[PDB]
Design a protein around this ligand. Structure first.
Ligand SMILES: [Ca+2]
Ligand SMILES: [Ca+2]
Ligand SMILES: [Ca+2]
Lengths: 119, 119
């Protein structure tokens, strides 16, 4: 579920405030994504967004509202070996994004980019 | 998921060994169960059994496979408010059943009960 996505990023990047930070960032961060990805970060958003899309190729698999199982082993993230297919697919999309976010630099210049102009 | 029910049980009844305590007791603790419940504990199980059957009334809600979110606050169990509807249902079934098995007396002469004669 989305709410677990955020907690998952806080798990990798502690000094971050997910809701604030990665919302309305570039062309892909935030709901939507159109045009080209302005940066490293934005790429991560892009790929994660396609992961959600792929995830719907699973029956009754709704990525936003599906809760799964994962633990945060101190900066380290782990998906429960027990999630069901949908769940495990969605946790992975999330796990991969999070790690990606932790390695991409953040450009204040992209927060609130002008989609409606720039994307 | 069933694994989380076991975990729930360990929270509410510390010291417990769910796979062996609550399994195969009465006419409803474990497997499937039918007939007349032999006592309070067994009665908890029948309520669980009934709860789960009502789970399936929600499209794509398989209680054994569906992982929900909850936490165990020092003996206390809390079902995440963000759980989707199905998850929420299943969370409650397990929660009511764990409280129930806590307030219930354990009758050892009802363990591995010949369900084909006493049920
Ligand atoms: Ca997006
Ligand atoms: Ca779930
Ligand atoms: Ca049963």
């Amino acid at each position: 579920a989305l709410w677990q996505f955020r907690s998952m990023i806080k798990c990798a990047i502690p000094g971050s405030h997910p809701l604030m930070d990665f919302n309305n960032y570039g062309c892909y961060c935030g709901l939507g994504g159109s045009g080209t990805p302005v940066d490293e970060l934005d790429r991560c958003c892009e790929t994660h967004d396609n992961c959600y899309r792929d995830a719907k190729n699973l029956s009754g698999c709704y990525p936003y509202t599906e809760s799964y199982s994962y633990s945060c082993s101190n900066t380290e993230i782990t998906c429960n070996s027990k999630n069901n297919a949908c769940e495990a697919f969605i946790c992975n999309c999330d796990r991969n994004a999070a790690i990606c976010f932790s390695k991409a630099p953040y450009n204040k210049e992209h927060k609130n980019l002008d989609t409606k102009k720039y994307c």
